[PDB]
Design a protein around this ligand. Structure first.
Ligand SMILES: Cc1cc2nc3c(=O)[nH]c(=O)nc-3n(C[C@H](O)[C@H](O)[C@H](O)COP(=O)(O)O)c2cc1C
Ligand SMILES: Cc1cc2nc3c(=O)[nH]c(=O)nc-3n(C[C@H](O)[C@H](O)[C@H](O)COP(=O)(O)O)c2cc1C
Ligand SMILES: Cc1cc2nc3c(=O)[nH]c(=O)nc-3n(C[C@H](O)[C@H](O)[C@H](O)COP(=O)(O)O)c2cc1C
Ligand SMILES: Cc1cc2nc3c(=O)[nH]c(=O)nc-3n(C[C@H](O)[C@H](O)[C@H](O)COP(=O)(O)O)c2cc1C
Ligand SMILES: CC(C)CCOP(=O)(O)OP(=O)(O)O
Ligand SMILES: CC(C)CCOP(=O)(O)OP(=O)(O)O
Ligand SMILES: CC(C)CCOP(=O)(O)OP(=O)(O)O
Ligand SMILES: CC(C)CCOP(=O)(O)OP(=O)(O)O
Ligand SMILES: [Mg+2]
Ligand SMILES: [Mg+2]
Ligand SMILES: [Mg+2]
Ligand SMILES: [Mg+2]
Lengths: 364, 364, 364, 364
């Protein structure tokens, strides 16, 4: 039944109209300044970067999506085996379903069988931490895929509108997380899920020892829309209310600025509606260390292995194009390349007290 | 004939295109910052608040609308009995028609028969104060429904365009109001009716001892539009002139900022185009103490009791969703949650000398 | 043939699509703050104001349009006799045609026969001043209609695109104007003709003794569009070039600000796209002493006397509505009522060094 | 085969939808202030200006386009003979094709046979400097047309997406350029090709001794779009990636401000989407010394000699119209005429640290 929600999520995300529905990343408000004389050759561009203790080929990761059933495991297999080939890290979806059901385990474990070298990121939800999960469940999630890190997701907006949702975000959960992190052999990443991380949330998490963030801002997969659709489907009246919240959240670009600014030493994944290598380049230039993608990887993987390989080729070419055209020889150079911030994003930053001058210093 | 206007008002408001016609609340310019870690559970959210000497369940009121005839009284009865059930305060429509016609009284009195505990708010127009109404008429309006307060409405824009309108707003009326307030057993609220309260008007009313305001800004029911339609109907040439004023007024959001800023200790209802619990949450976060609704309550009540009950359930769920997602455990926390002000509202505030820093301190 | 241009002008302005074509007044960027308690009664509003040595009923004038042929004279007659009835001043069109042709004189003179008391404003073009017109021509224009003032029009944009146009605006013309003003028994108003007066032009004219200005900004009658159409008609290739300049000029609202700011003691007509009494009210609140109108008076006059009477009633009602709703008892109060400046007009003012604070002081 | 790309470029530029495709010049954000009293006569307007050691009739140049084959040479012939007649300078297209193929030479040389007096500008691409071109190749390009200057183009964005592209922009190329300039008898202009010059690129080039720039910003011919179309045509998957970059680059207007500000003594060509004499006037008022045009000259030349003559008449009239209407008697006066900067251009400048006050001083 949790396994049912799992297939339904994939089905709605993949096949319904939920990508950027009534929402925005604000990334149109970010412009990378063109350099007519780049000072480099396309072929000397170096996209390698660090991901904790490993080196990755490209400053992009696939963020967590699925698992919990055979056909979900075969999607995970395709994603893992292509991510392995391209040298890019992969998060799996929530492993709750596999803590609850032993039959669901193989759909996660397959990932490490087929991807022995890339970083693999485990996944559990924050509500489970308030509902009995602790050290041993985290260790199980980690060992199940020989994870290099664990992502703990924030999805209170999704939980609020989800028919069987669990909107339990008591502070006790952070106390528990902080304790768990003491004993864990791998780092914790705290990621949102379509609604973004603000400076108040980032500072709170940091105060409990969290140093690794994944923005997952509005403007990509709309998880309120997905649950709205699940509510429409089962005649649940929360559907009409969900519609009022479709543009709820911190836009990806605003979230990147907010996290980088409020916690300048954070290791930061910029994700939520990254759809091209240009999006990826903007997210990095703005302040992220790596760009995250989920939905377009799902849709490609469903079409097949070769389709997903072509997808990654395209993303990597686009990223390098944006590095070439900004004179950025490597990832560090891109992080400090010249940008323009305009429009609503500029107004957002101004109101939120993000001094642009100190901002520019911090992102460089 | 006044009773005729009363039915015509309800009919045009309920069934014609007058809601936000060529007007705007500016509430799109207000964004509540999403908190990925709320620090609370949905079920611990407390929406109780004070309304003068009573406690109400939810920081929302139904503002005054109707009365004056049987079928208008049956609408009032539906509204009152549902408002009683939900623990929310209800204003009635103008009681002038019931001061003028004894047959109209029951259509107001029914309200207190069916709603013994909730705050009930009386209603008289400012133009009547200029035209001979005094203490006794106020006392009659109050006792008629055992009111906990009286609303005195400002509708000069409506009166200007109304075929039988009375645009008499001499300053003498305020001297009279101040005198009446000395002797009244319940507080006075001064409310607008679709065109909003500016700082000049708020400060003027305050200088005369008015401490309780209801913004009723532009962006919701368009009363100039209603009278334009009444003019079109009777071939009155004022109709074409009304069309030029459809976007006349202070937008609800700007009016909330203006009243809170210029009279920081005011008890403030934010109303005019509040259509969801998210609107309600924005209005409160901006500076209102409670959100007011009229038109969508009318339209639901016309459909029936159960329809109105479902409407309030939806509003309350949406409000609590916005409280959850900003980490607001109670109404006081919502009043000081993090916001972003963008666009035309920001430009409005800047021109009007609303220092945003002192504004943030004042709204808390 | 000049008489032909006169007929063609009226015909294109009245019946073709040239009103606000690809242009804007910026008046949407000006908002009059609504006062829910005006402090006045509609019937005590006083709209009287000064126009040089005469009193006028309403702070509105009909600006110069036509004359030069019988049917143009009958239009002038209708305008004059209604303007006389309403106590509002009337400018006539360019009297060049009547200096050049004795048969054209009656079409101007009729105006004073039918309107003995209102201010009547003569009209000559600046290019005529560079081409031989002097004191006597001015005196003839004045005595022809017993004028209370003379308007000298600036139309370089129109002259550039006009098939038989005369774009001669040598500085010598100003020396001449200054000399002529020494000897003239009535004041000179310098007016534009759809393209507006900037601060550089206003200060220049002031340095030569001009104190009376009529903005005639872009956003109403588009004179470049009129000449474009005349060019299209006669296969003149200047038509395609005119199209590139359709949005050329200082917007009416910007021009009012610019003239009031740069020449604070000016007597100022705000005109160019004034289409309602609300437009008129905004223009005066912004800084004008009176609002000017041409095109909509033309279109009404063509329909007839009664049609023009209804038009003025509508304008006057709308003005008084805007005065009522801002608590403006008289024209002086309107000149200092509260406004909001937003959008492009705000950006225009900022770039042009119009300090908003000193601006508010100067207009009040 | 390079000859083939040459024909294909002309064909796609002339006949496909690539002019301002998903791009913008930002020139709508620049407004020349209208002067109702110009202080001059149309006929006294002087448009003559300096182009290195020659005088040209009009502050406009045809920037480099084509050559390399007979039919391309006949286009160059038409352009050269009309440019000669109008006294305006002409750049030729890349002469690489003529260094590589002796048969291609006549298609460039024809230009000087038919245009003996106007400035003629040679052309070579920056990638060729990293690939073996040096002094002698420059001298050959120059002598081939008795050039008065050489343009070295920057096209890294084009090279990235070009099927046979050469995205080699190593810094060594500037070292070489600086050396070559020591020994060359004519000055070097560095020009972009539809994606614009930033302050970082301008300052870099300046640090290597480059004093003459041609902005070629986005908003006109979209070279990424041209290569996208060439990619679509040959089934190259880079096509989908090109689509993501269609709005990549510095908008012409922004580039003019950036180069003028960062290198205040530069000799500056403002080009990229200059389509009218009004565009030309804005570019000069903004900070350019001359306006450049390519695409609309190509399209006219393809129609014929008389068509191109009419095109230049139209451009010249529009320029003089804009000078008339700003009171600009000559090109120096236009360079310091009053402007307003609004919108995205204003935001661009602000973020990039272009102080508008020091900007106004520098451009005047
Ligand atoms: C079908 C699907 C399932 C997902 N499930 C999870 C989950 O189990 N755990 C998690 O942390 N994020 C999950 N996500 C959220 C993504 O990891 C990501 O944060 C979000 O979708 C925004 O990125 P995108 O716009 O590139 O999809 C899911 C995404 C998709 C499309
Ligand atoms: C049919 C109807 C009649 C109304 N009559 C009154 C009135 O008698 N007195 C009053 O103060 N306001 C009256 N109102 C104005 C409302 O109380 C409220 O201020 C305004 O409609 C804006 O709120 P809304 O957009 O939620 O309707 C009326 C509203 C409606 C829809
Ligand atoms: C048909 C017509 C002819 C006009 N001719 C004259 C003219 O002779 N002299 C003059 O000063 N302005 C003349 N005007 C310009 C107007 O006085 C006015 O400045 C301009 O039309 C802007 O006002 P509007 O938008 O209300 O028309 C003419 C206007 C119209 C509609
Ligand atoms: C068909 C065509 C070919 C071009 N080839 C050249 C080239 O060989 N060298 C060069 O420097 N620029 C070349 N350009 C770029 C233009 O000179 C100019 O910088 C750019 O097109 C922007 O101006 P526009 O928008 O007026 O076309 C070419 C332009 C066109 C339309
Ligand atoms: C986006 C995302 C977190 C989707 C998973 O949400 P979920 O609440 O269904 O996950 P759980 O299985 O952990 O409850
Ligand atoms: C919005 C609102 C005040 C509608 C009632 O206006 P009205 O002038 O019809 O009310 P009265 O019966 O008090 O005159
Ligand atoms: C708007 C306006 C001045 C129209 C009259 O322009 P015109 O050049 O036709 O007038 P003249 O008869 O004075 O030349
Ligand atoms: C715009 C422009 C420079 C077009 C010419 O680019 P190209 O790379 O084809 O020129 P080359 O022949 O110099 O390579
Ligand atoms: Mg969950
Ligand atoms: Mg009334
Ligand atoms: Mg003329
Ligand atoms: Mg090349």
């Amino acid at each position: 039944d949790i396994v049912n929600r799992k297939v339904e999520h994939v089905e709605i995300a993949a096949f319904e109209n939920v990508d950027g529905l009534s929402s925005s990343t604000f990334l149109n408000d970010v412009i990378l300044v063109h350099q007519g004389f780049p000072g480099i050759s396309f072929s000397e561009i170096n996209t390698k970067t660090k991901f904790f203790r490993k080196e990755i080929s490209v400053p992009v990761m696939v963020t967590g999506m699925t698992g919990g059933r055979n056909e979900l495991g075969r999607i995970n297999k395709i994603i893992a085996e292509v991510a392995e080939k391209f040298g890019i890290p992969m998060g799996v979806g929530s492993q709750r379903v596999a803590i609850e059901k032993a039959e669901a385990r193989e759909s996660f474990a397959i990932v490490r069988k087929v991807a022995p070298t890339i970083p693999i990121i485990a996944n559990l939800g924050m509500p489970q931490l308030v509902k009995g999960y602790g050290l041993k469940e985290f260790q199980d999630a980690i060992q199940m895929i020989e994870a290099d890190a664990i992502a703990v997701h924030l999805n209170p907006a999704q939980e609020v509108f989800q028919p069987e949702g669990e909107p339990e975000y008591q502070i006790y959960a952070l106390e528990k997380l902080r304790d768990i992190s003491k004993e864990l052999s791998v780092p914790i990443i705290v990621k949102e899920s379509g609604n973004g991380i603000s400076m108040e949330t980032a500072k709170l998490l940091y105060s409990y020892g969290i140093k690794n963030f994944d923005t997952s801002g509005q403007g990509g997969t709309n998880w309120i829309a997905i649950e709205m659709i699940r509510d429409i489907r089962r005649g649940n009246w929360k559907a009409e209310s969900a519609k009022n919240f479709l543009d709820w959240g911190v836009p990806t670009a605003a979230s990147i600025m907010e996290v980088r600014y409020s916690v300048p030493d954070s290791f930061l994944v910029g994700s939520g509606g990254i759809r091209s290598g240009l999006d990826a380049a903007k997210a990095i230039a703005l302040g992220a260390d790596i760009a995250g993608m989920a939905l377009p990887v799902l849709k490609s993987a469903i079409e097949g292995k070769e389709s997903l390989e072509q997808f990654f080729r395209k993303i990597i070419f686009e990223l390098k194009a944006a590095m070439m055209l900004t004179g950025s020889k490597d990832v560090d150079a891109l992080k400090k390349t010249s940008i323009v911030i305009l429009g609503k994003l500029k107004e957002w930053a101004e109101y939120r007290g993000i001094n642009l001058s100190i901002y520019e210093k911090v992102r460089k």
